[PDB]
């Protein structure tokens, strides 16, 4: 009834020892142990890891014999490592960056390859102070767009293939079939995600074209104000009169420049709209005035610069009576 059959139970020996030849591998094994997984899964997972160890030995021996050269074998092993961790989703990481660092560095120098990218990078870097710290921030979002876009495009292109299957896409359906949260939802996500991305790039354009320095770059209430003082700085009547008219014209000139700038901005908007026509009309006329207005603006700034130096020196001191 009992059927003892067998029942071995000899004294225990070596209650501990080394499992894997590597401590690192041993650590991972312990991690799986604490995780606790089904018997079948544990045996299968453990087996796979064992294969990796064996393969490692083989790779070493192959190199010893002298066969590997491209290094694809090692790359395959590395890729598998990431793949296994990726599937398990145990590829956890956190920011910390220890106090010490290799600070070694010594590889190929790279940064900008596409001329278009160099335009924005250099434009800001010089347009103001877009120092690699600020440029880096802009780059954070730049690549962010590249990665997100590739995911949407890559994923779309991925499922796009499963559409021309045996070349067949048509059925007695005005809109296939929608019952809620099916097709319409996908289209909405497409417009929402793409428009968001499109708006994102537009935002970057607006930031670089709008999110820049504001307020007058000069018109300081010090230099110009000082000239205004001139009168209160105790001057002669003749010099005061010539000065009064001189200052009046200076303030009037700057004011006029500002007016042109306003019209220049509006004119620019019209140019963009007119260009949308495609007929090429009004484009030439708008461009002509566009450059002319820009020319006067630049010319005015130049004149002010010279006037600033001339007046600065002459006003330095009304030493020669009427100067």
From Swiss-Prot:
Its main location: endoplasmic reticulum. GO terms for biological process: amyloid-beta clearance by transcytosis; extracellular negative regulation of signal transduction; negative regulation of amyloid-beta clearance; negative regulation of protein binding; negative regulation of receptor internalization; negative regulation of very-low-density lipoprotein particle clearance; positive regulation of amyloid-beta clearance; regulation of receptor-mediated endocytosis. N-glycosylated. Changing residue 307 to A: Strongly reduced interaction with LRP1. Residues 1-18 have a biased composition (Basic and acidic residues). The modification Phosphothreonine is found at residue 214. The keyword Endoplasmic reticulum applies. GO terms for molecular function: amyloid-beta binding; heparin binding; lipase binding; low-density lipoprotein particle receptor binding; receptor antagonist activity; receptor ligand activity; signaling receptor binding; very-low-density lipoprotein particle receptor binding. SUPFAM superfamilies: RAP domain-like (SSF47045). Glycans are attached at residue 234. The keyword Signal applies. Changing residue 257 to A: Strongly reduced interaction with LRP1. Keywords: Coiled coil, Endoplasmic reticulum, Endosome, Glycoprotein, Golgi apparatus, Heparin-binding, Phosphoprotein, Signal. Residues 203-319 are annotated as: LDL receptor binding. Molecular chaperone for LDL receptor-related proteins that may regulate their ligand binding activity along the secretory pathway. Belongs to the alpha-2-MRAP family. This is Alpha-2-macroglobulin receptor-associated protein. It comes from Homo sapiens.
């Amino acid at each position: 009834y009992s059927r003892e059959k067998n029942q071995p139970k000899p004294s225990p020996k070596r209650e501990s020892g080394e499992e894997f030849r590597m401590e690192k591998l041993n650590q991972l094994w312990e991690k799986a142990q604490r995780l606790h997984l089904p018997p079948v899964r544990l045996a299968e997972l453990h087996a796979d890891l064992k294969i990796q160890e064996r393969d490692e030995l083989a790779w070493k021996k192959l190199k010893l014999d002298g066969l590997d050269e491209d290094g694809e074998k090692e790359a395959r092993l590395i890729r598998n490592l990431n793949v296994i961790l990726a599937k398990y989703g145990l590829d956890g990481k956190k920011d910390a960056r220890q106090v010490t660092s290799n600070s070694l560095s010594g590889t190929q120098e790279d940064g900008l390859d596409d001329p278009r990218l160099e335009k924005l990078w250099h434009k800001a870097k010089t347009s103001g102070k877009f120092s690699g710290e600020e440029l880096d921030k802009l780059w954070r979002e730049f690549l962010h767009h590249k990665e997100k876009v590739h995911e949407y495009n890559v994923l779309l292109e991925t499922l796009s293939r499963t559409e021309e299957i045996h070349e067949n896409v048509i059925s007695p359906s005005d809109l296939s079939d929608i019952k809620g949260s099916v097709l319409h939802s996908r289209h909405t996500e497409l417009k929402e995600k793409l428009r968001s991305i499109n708006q994102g790039l537009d935002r970057l354009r607006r930031v670089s074209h709008q999110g820049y320095s504001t307020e007058a770059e000069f018109e300081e209430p010090r230099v110009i104000d000082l000239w205004d003082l001139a009168q209160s700085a105790n001057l002669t009547d003749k010099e005061l009169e010539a000065f009064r008219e001189e200052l009046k014209h200076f303030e009037a000139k700057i004011e006029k420049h500002n007016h042109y700038q306003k019209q220049l901005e509006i004119a620019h908007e019209k140019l963009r709209h007119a260009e949308s026509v495609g007929d090429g009309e009004r484009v030439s006329r708008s461009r002509e005035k566009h450059a002319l207005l820009e020319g006067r603006t630049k010319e005015l700034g130049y004149t002010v610069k010279k006037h600033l130096q001339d007046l600065s020196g002459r006003i330095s001191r009304a030493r020669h009576n009427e100067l």
